[PDB]
Amino acid sequence: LSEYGTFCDNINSILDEVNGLLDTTQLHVADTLMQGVTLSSNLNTNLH
Amino acid sequence: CTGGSEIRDLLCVQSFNGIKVLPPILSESQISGYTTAATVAAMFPPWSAAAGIPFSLNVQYRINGLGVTMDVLNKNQKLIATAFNNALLSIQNGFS
Amino acid sequence: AQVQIDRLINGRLTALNAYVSQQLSDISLVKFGAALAMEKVNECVKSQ
Amino acid sequence: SVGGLYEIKIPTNFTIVGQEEFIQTNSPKVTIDCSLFVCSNYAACHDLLSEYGTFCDNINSILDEVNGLLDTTQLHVADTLMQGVTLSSNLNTNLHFDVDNINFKSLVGCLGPHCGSSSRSFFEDLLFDKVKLSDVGFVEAYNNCTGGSEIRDLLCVQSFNGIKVLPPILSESQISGYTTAATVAAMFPPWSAAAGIPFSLNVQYRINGLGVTMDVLNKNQKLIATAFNNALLSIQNGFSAPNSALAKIQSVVNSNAQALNSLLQQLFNKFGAISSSLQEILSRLDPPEAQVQIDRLINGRLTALNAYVSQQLSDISLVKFGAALAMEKVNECVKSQSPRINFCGNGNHILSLVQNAPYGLLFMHFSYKPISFKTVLVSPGLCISGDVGIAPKQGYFIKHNDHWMFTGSSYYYPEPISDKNVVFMNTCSVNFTKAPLVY
Amino acid sequence: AQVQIDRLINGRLTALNAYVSQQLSDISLVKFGAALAMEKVNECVKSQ
Amino acid sequence: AVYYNSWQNLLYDSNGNIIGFKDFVTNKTYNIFPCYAGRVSAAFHQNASSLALLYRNLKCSYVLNNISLTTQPYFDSYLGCVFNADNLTDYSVSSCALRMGSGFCVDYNSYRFVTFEPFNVSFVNDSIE
Amino acid sequence: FTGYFPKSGANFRDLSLKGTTYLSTLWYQKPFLSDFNNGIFSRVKNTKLYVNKTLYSEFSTIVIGSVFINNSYTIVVQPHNGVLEITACQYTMCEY
Amino acid sequence: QYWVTPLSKRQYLLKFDNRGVITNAVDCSSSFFSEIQCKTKSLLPNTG
Numbered sequence A: 001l002s003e004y005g006t007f008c009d010n011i012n013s014i015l016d017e018v019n020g021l022l023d024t025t026q027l028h029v030a031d032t033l034m035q036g037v038t039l040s041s042n043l044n045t046n047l048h
Numbered sequence B: 001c002t003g004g005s006e007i008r009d010l011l012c013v014q015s016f017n018g019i020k021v022l023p024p025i026l027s028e029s030q031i032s033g034y035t036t037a038a039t040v041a042a043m044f045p046p047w048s049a050a051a052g053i054p055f056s057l058n059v060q061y062r063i064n065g066l067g068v069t070m071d072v073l074n075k076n077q078k079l080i081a082t083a084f085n086n087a088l089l090s091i092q093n094g095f096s
Numbered sequence C, E: 001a002q003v004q005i006d007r008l009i010n011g012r013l014t015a016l017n018a019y020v021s022q023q024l025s026d027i028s029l030v031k032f033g034a035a036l037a038m039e040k041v042n043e044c045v046k047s048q
Numbered sequence D: 001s002v003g004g005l006y007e008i009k010i011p012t013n014f015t016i017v018g019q020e021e022f023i024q025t026n027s028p029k030v031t032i033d034c035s036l037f038v039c040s041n042y043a044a045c046h047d048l049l050s051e052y053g054t055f056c057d058n059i060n061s062i063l064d065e066v067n068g069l070l071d072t073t074q075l076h077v078a079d080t081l082m083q084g085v086t087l088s089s090n091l092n093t094n095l096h097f098d099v100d101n102i103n104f105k106s107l108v109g110c111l112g113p114h115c116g117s118s119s120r121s122f123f124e125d126l127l128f129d130k131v132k133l134s135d136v137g138f139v140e141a142y143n144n145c146t147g148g149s150e151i152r153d154l155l156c157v158q159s160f161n162g163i164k165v166l167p168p169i170l171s172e173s174q175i176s177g178y179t180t181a182a183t184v185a186a187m188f189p190p191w192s193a194a195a196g197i198p199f200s201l202n203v204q205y206r207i208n209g210l211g212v213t214m215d216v217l218n219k220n221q222k223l224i225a226t227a228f229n230n231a232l233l234s235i236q237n238g239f240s241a242p243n244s245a246l247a248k249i250q251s252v253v254n255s256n257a258q259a260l261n262s263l264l265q266q267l268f269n270k271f272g273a274i275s276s277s278l279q280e281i282l283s284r285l286d287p288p289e290a291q292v293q294i295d296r297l298i299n300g301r302l303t304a305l306n307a308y309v310s311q312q313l314s315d316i317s318l319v320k321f322g323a324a325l326a327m328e329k330v331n332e333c334v335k336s337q338s339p340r341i342n343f344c345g346n347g348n349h350i351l352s353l354v355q356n357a358p359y360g361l362l363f364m365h366f367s368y369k370p371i372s373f374k375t376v377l378v379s380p381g382l383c384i385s386g387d388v389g390i391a392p393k394q395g396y397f398i399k400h401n402d403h404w405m406f407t408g409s410s411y412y413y414p415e416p417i418s419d420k421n422v423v424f425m426n427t428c429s430v431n432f433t434k435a436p437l438v439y
Numbered sequence F: 001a002v003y004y005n006s007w008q009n010l011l012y013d014s015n016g017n018i019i020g021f022k023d024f025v026t027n028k029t030y031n032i033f034p035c036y037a038g039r040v041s042a043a044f045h046q047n048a049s050s051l052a053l054l055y056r057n058l059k060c061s062y063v064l065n066n067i068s069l070t071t072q073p074y075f076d077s078y079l080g081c082v083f084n085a086d087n088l089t090d091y092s093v094s095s096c097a098l099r100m101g102s103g104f105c106v107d108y109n110s111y112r113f114v115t116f117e118p119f120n121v122s123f124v125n126d127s128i129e
Numbered sequence G: 001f002t003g004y005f006p007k008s009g010a011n012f013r014d015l016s017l018k019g020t021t022y023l024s025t026l027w028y029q030k031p032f033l034s035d036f037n038n039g040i041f042s043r044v045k046n047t048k049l050y051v052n053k054t055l056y057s058e059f060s061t062i063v064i065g066s067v068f069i070n071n072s073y074t075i076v077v078q079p080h081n082g083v084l085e086i087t088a089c090q091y092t093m094c095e096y
Numbered sequence H: 001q002y003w004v005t006p007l008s009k010r011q012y013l014l015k016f017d018n019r020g021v022i023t024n025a026v027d028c029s030s031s032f033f034s035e036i037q038c039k040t041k042s043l044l045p046n047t048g
């Protein structure tokens, strides 16, 4: 397998790029959820 | 996978063969906290996720924008609120 | 042994390539769906 | 709610913040000569590769389809930029570059073909200079492959091995000219990209639509214009820092270079053969065994080409998605202001402008940014006179000088309650604050 | 005959894998176009 | 070259290719560079009886001196040496079937090398003041 | 590059022995008499001595062989103050 | 001082300076950081 060269390197690089895209996407989704959200510090959901 | 169980989980075999699912960078608990923060942003002032007005008033105005007179909306506020939380309860019960 | 192991290496590397391509294709759809979800968060939940 | 009033922080002061956004609409058009890549100069390899038939034809066809998709996408983006743009023939950007105290000099290049390729703006010049491998960068790098230099450029090796990036059908100079034409369309009459009104008036109306009274806007016009061009300058100067949009632009070039280098590295994999060099195999073995080795090299190289082709298809799908998003933003943030809250950047979006970038478009989103806040008690509605309900339009009802008054939600400025800033209701809702003395 | 048929099997399976990858990539674009068409039906035909 | 020691005569890159050598007999040192390889971008129109050839990123002098002598007319375009096409970049076309890149088109009536300008600005002569 | 290299993180062994008049028989046994296997890497200190302020170079001599008797070749690497004499001969190697 | 260590067939990462001198080396299988260095073919891998 070491004499096949960069085959496993290409596999790993592509999967790393895919997973980094997933991570960036999750960060963007979280940013969209929390964009512009202002909450009162008096807010206590156990009673409100 | 290292508990020594007699059960042969396919995930453990896959991981032993180099196929593993890694957790996301943000846990689903963090995402649920974000969604909770976005949801409570609609109930209470400053109503940062409900156009700066109380949630019930936003619901009433949205219904009025569909072609419903405000007179029935502001006298049936109790009925509208009960319909809303009954719809929410139906959504919850639909998962069963 | 090298003659047999090379056939196994080639088969397993082809399978990894196919899985990699399918994963890229699926993650494109995941990105599209996440973009739709962010748009809905912006234009259905946070506003109308 | 203390009685009928809630506590709300309403801005008392504001500025205009500019936010960059690079959206990739294009990518380097990679073309592979499959025959030259797989077999170089070697007749014995080309003979064996010809027995594999349509594999190289399939690679070439798929890459041609991908590059044609990129070309059609670039044409569509240019068409979107140029749609509806009407400019005066008296427009000469050498003298007309600012209006109503807003400076667009850096956003405007030469207008008209008579100035040549100098249609690129100072903004776009500053952005393009920091990316070496644009379209012209690739053209120059491939021009230098026969200059006789001692430098061993990787691009020249790739081109000699059949891996070459072709220029886009429209040069980035043409795209910069299109963006300049789109930008000046908001400067001057007929204001074909600013809703048919002067740019400053459009900015003022967009801010007013956020809940800001017209009085402070048309009294602080100079301050608003200064904040606007300060935000533009902040964007331009932020390009010098480790800017995220510049990093995103350079990521396209870096990923293309990494993919091309990885594809070139396939020519040095042995794939189980005695050597990765066709020269060595053909100098070591006769046709019977040389064929066996060359077949392993042909199979490895064809598999690598197929993998690269699949990756390129997947990547160009995302490029098309990004270009569709960029065209939508050009239509609904720059040329007009669609009522979509966080579509054109975050926050209270006022207005957007577009500039050409390498392999994409750079959008400048200008937002209303509150500076200081006042906590005030507000009423979301009042029950007045004959139990008639009134609700504030993009604002709140406040008690000012022991008197019910209206203020905008985005700027604290108490003003008398009138039908201009009120929604009437025949019956007031419950918990609306009682105010029989109003009107 | 097994040696020859194996080379034909490998070539034909590689061609099928390549076609499968291309089909996945194309159907992603078909889905994007259909989403655009549904959006236009909703926001140009049924409403403005 | 000063990096050759007494026992060394070959220069290699990271990929194992020979890129330089010291001659054993004369001790003269050389760099080894690959011979030029490339394609020809041929623009064909169905109604034509010939081809317009574009040697991308090659000057016409280089093509003639080191690749092939031809009797066809040639000129140095931005994209490279162009054969059998008139240099008419001052002319423009809004539609193009033979797109060569960087806003250049090959237009057949002979072939002409013209600029590709698919989009215009609508112009009015009203005042901007 | 794949070649005959030391293992990083392994230990060098200082096998140099300096005596004055007496030779210990334990010096000519394990672990001093060591197996060769694929090969060895040597890091040798050049002990620089001075006689009438004239520099003299000395360091230990190493022998590589198998049985160390005159029907077998022993490789000997012996310094001679700037001259490294390397021989491979059928030496009658001494007991000590 | 005569320091002796065993030799074996091992893969190394050899760095040559601009004058052809081996200035640094990495025993790829010696340690985890060595594995990272050989994987990236650099003495100082990028943060990741």
Ligand SMILES: *[C@@H]1O[C@H](CO)[C@@H](O[C@@H]2O[C@H](CO)[C@@H](O[C@@H]3O[C@H](CO)[C@@H](O)[C@H](O)[C@@H]3O)[C@H](O)[C@H]2NC(C)=O)[C@H](O)[C@H]1NC(C)=O
Pocket: D098, D099, D100, D101, D102, D200, D221
């Ligand atoms: C309303 O009409 C007036 C009069 O036409 C406009 O005033 C003009 O405003 C421009 C700014 O866009 C001034 O240009 C300035 O020139 C100075 C150098 O003198 C330079 O330092 C500034 O940076 C700016 O470029 C121009 O001089 C000025 N002309 C006059 C006669 O006042 C005004 O812009 C129009 N709009 C508004 C909102 O007032």
Ligand SMILES: *[C@@H]1O[C@H](CO)[C@@H](O[C@@H]2O[C@H](CO)[C@@H](O)[C@H](O)[C@H]2NC(C)=O)[C@H](O)[C@H]1NC(C)=O
Pocket: F006, F025, F026, F027
């Ligand atoms: C080329 O260089 C080699 C290496 O220096 C020369 O060979 C040496 O020449 C000297 C001078 O006669 C001898 O003392 C050495 O024994 C030779 N060999 C080595 C390994 O140094 C050689 O003479 C040179 N030839 C030319 C034509 O310049």
Ligand SMILES: *[C@@H]1O[C@H](CO)[C@@H](O[C@@H]2O[C@H](CO)[C@@H](O)[C@H](O)[C@H]2NC(C)=O)[C@H](O)[C@H]1NC(C)=O
Pocket: F075, F076, F077, F087, F088, F089, F090
């Ligand atoms: C190809 O044609 C173009 C257009 O005629 C030439 O460019 C012009 O060249 C003249 C003479 O040098 C200049 O005066 C013009 O200013 C140029 N115009 C532009 C827009 O560049 C070009 O030189 C010709 N090239 C060749 C090789 O014949």
Ligand SMILES: *[C@@H]1O[C@H](CO)[C@@H](O)[C@H](O)[C@H]1NC(C)=O
Pocket: D012, D013, D014, D371
């Ligand atoms: C708003 O803030 C700016 C800078 O912080 C200041 O110069 C200006 O005077 C402020 N205006 C008001 C009305 O507070």
Ligand SMILES: *[C@@H]1O[C@H](CO)[C@@H](O)[C@H](O)[C@H]1NC(C)=O
Pocket: D137, D140, D141, D144, D147, D149
């Ligand atoms: C091409 O070579 C010239 C002259 O050597 C040099 O000035 C220029 O920077 C080079 N450009 C590229 C892209 O290599």
Ligand SMILES: *[C@@H]1O[C@H](CO)[C@@H](O)[C@H](O)[C@H]1NC(C)=O
Pocket: F094, F118, F119, F120
């Ligand atoms: C664009 O304008 C030029 C200059 O007047 C003209 O020759 C050309 O026909 C126009 N093309 C289109 C598509 O309007």
Ligand SMILES: *[C@@H]1O[C@H](CO)[C@@H](O)[C@H](O)[C@H]1NC(C)=O
Pocket: F125, F126
């Ligand atoms: C604009 O063009 C029209 C039509 O030729 C002409 O009547 C008018 O005088 C022109 N106006 C100016 C200012 O050139």
